[model samples]
Target: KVYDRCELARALKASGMDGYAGNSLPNWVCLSKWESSYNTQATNRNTDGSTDYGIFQINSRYWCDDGRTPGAKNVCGIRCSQLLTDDLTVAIRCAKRVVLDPNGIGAWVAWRLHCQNQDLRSYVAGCGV
Candidate 1:
């Protein structure tokens, strides 16, 4: 299922990701824009033979298992397909684990290049959260 930006913002806020990993709601909102554009089914193939899964684009290399990929660490202990659903509970839980890494939110290259160090108020400007 697809989500609008505001809906995603509200969902993230309600899920406590607003302050997760030192990232505010806007940070997550902005990151999602660059990562998946609020599409729950988003996925991307990386040049390195890894695939990114779901809204946050969690990598199969170290996070979820896509089965086709070999040697995935499956750190989130979930199937990659699970993240492509409308329900974000598993996705949010796994994302928290990703943030626990030393890189924090920097684990996502998109967040590092786009959301980080930016004025992000507009990401949640009309969300009413």
Candidate 2:
């Protein structure tokens, strides 16, 4: 049930979420790699014996709801495998809701602005275009 990189990438772009105007894609990709290594089912290991779950490594208690799907009752609502089942944009939308707080792209928008100002040493520099 491991998610594929190209599949994840496609989902990310299809989410209809506008990345930073100049170079956000690179930044997004970089962030995704850093956060989850594109592993939709990635989990975080706690040194204290607690288990963090799901891709984007969201905690189990944070948003895992029942009735969405079987065995999806862990964290982040949808299962990591479900990430591959749906469109990339859907996952990106979910990420925005959780990470960006749905406030007009929230932190992502701000990051784009910051990245764009610096002449794009990273991908966010040329986001919008």
Candidate 3:
């Protein structure tokens, strides 16, 4: 489920993520673009033995439960697999949780380095959101 930039923008906007937790829609779009390129099934193995799952790359170590990640906090109360679907309902919800941390949307290093403090108009341009 790779998404076009505007396509992803419209979806996220519709999901109440725009300005969610004080993180604007573009930051979320930018995060997904860098984190997973908007692929619903995207994943990554962390060097610390945890894994990141789904479009937002919510990590198993603190967010979702994989039943295998050591010392997982499962703060999102979701199975890692739940984040993998194209529906994005659970995936979006879980991502919402990730933003609640003190880091805000800075929870993802990708967002910190790529989206933060940048002009983000293009991420939502022409999306009619």
Candidate 4:
């Protein structure tokens, strides 16, 4: 599912991403936008023999078990396929877990490159989130 801008903002807010792990709502919205462009089915295959799945682009190499990435830690203890579902349940859960790492919001290269240190108020403005 490709979510509208405000739609994803509201959904992320309702999911407690507003201030999750000390990160603000705009940061979460920005991360999702750049990571998957609000497309729930987005997937990226890395040359490192791992895959990134779903909106948050959680990786099979560390976060989920795709049964393809060798020695996958599956730290989230979920199958990578589960993140591709339109439902945000598992994907959001896993994303929250990812932020818990020492990197916090820095875990995502997209966020680091596009969102970090930027004014992100525009990402969630007028979204009623």
Candidate 5:
């Protein structure tokens, strides 16, 4: 009924987050270990002593809006539930809103294949999805 860090990592990899592949996994794992230790309920404190919350350390209040209500079966709660479900979709879409190019496929393309361990390494390197 629940998932652990490895399962969570696999789910994240499967749900179009493979740009977090190659070297990114180590960085992500480190950050996840340090920030949340894979605990979805983790929270952090800013230098200003403000409350930052959640696995990726999103500020509960700021990110809590947009269907991510802290205690509801909303985006935040669902993302906290697992990394391969609708919550993952919401997280990716939200991240792309701030960082991905509106006209480009962005990291999600890479994410789609990152978990599959093929020898192909580039977008035009003879790999077909």
Candidate 6:
């Protein structure tokens, strides 16, 4: 649940979502830093009444059900809270689904706004993969 940048990077690499999504490890690391700072329990309630969950900040609107909101499409077929756990298997799986969509990682606003077109090499420069 608590991970420094390097530790988070290592865990993410181990999970294999980076490779599955065709994303570099540094890109995932940078996106996580900007999205949730490696806090698996991190959550955010948007002004649109949607909530974002976990390290990737996946949205309940299309990805998961929060149980309170109606008409949730639940594309991932998992509870939003499921992603809030230290185990990242389900989260990584759902994230891969999102990445495979037309928008790719651009589905994550943090990735689009903060990580896109940036030199992200420093994110994993000395982590030794």
* Candidate numbers sorted by lDDT from highest down: 4, 3, 1, 6, 2, 5
Query: How close to the true structure is residue 1 of candidate 4, measured as C-alpha lDDT?
Result: 93
Residue 56 in model 3: lDDT:
91
Off by over 4 Å in 2: 1-8, 20-23, 47-50, 65-90, 102-129
Output the number of the TM-score-best candidate.
Answer: 4
Q: Where does candidate 5 clash, by residue pair?
A: 18-111
Sliding window of 10 residues with minimal summed lDDT for model 5? 120-129
Cα misplacement distance, residue 80 of candidate 2 (Å):
6.9
Stretches of candidate 1 off by over 4 Å are: none
Model 5, C-alpha of 38: deviation from truth (Å): 0.6
In model 4, the Cα lDDT at residue 76 comes to 91
Minimum summed lDDT over a 10-residue window in model 4 is located at: 9-18
Per-residue CA lDDT of model 5 for 23-106, tens digit only, reads 343333334444455555555554543344444444433333323443332324433223223244554444434234342322
Sorting all predicted structures by TM-score, with the top scorer first, yields 4, 3, 1, 6, 2, 5
Each prediction's RMSD to truth? 1.0, 7.1, 0.9, 0.8, 9.9, 1.1
Instruction: Please write out the lDDT profile of model 4 over residues 69-100, one tens digit for every residue.
Output: 98799999998999988789899999999999
**Cα displacement (Å) at residue 55, model 3:** 0.8
**TM-score of every prediction relative to native:** 0.95, 0.47, 0.96, 0.97, 0.44, 0.94
> Can you write out model 6's per-residue Cα lDDT over 1-129, one digit (the tens) per residue?
967888888888898856666788888888889999889999999877889999999999999999866567999999899999998888888998889898888888889898999999899888888
TM-score of 4: 0.97
Quality of model 1 by C-alpha lDDT: 0.89
- Candidate 2 per-residue lDDT, tens place, 1-129, comes to 344544544455655433633324455555455556565556564454333333444433344432333333343445444444323543554555565444432333333444334443443334333
Give the poorly placed runs of model 4, Cα more than 4 Å off: none
Q: What is the C-alpha lDDT of each candidate?
A: 0.89, 0.45, 0.90, 0.91, 0.41, 0.88
Q: Cα deviation of 34 in candidate 6 (Å)? A: 0.3
Candidate 1, run of 10 with poorest lDDT: 18-27
Candidate 5: deviation at residue 26, Å? Answer: 3.4
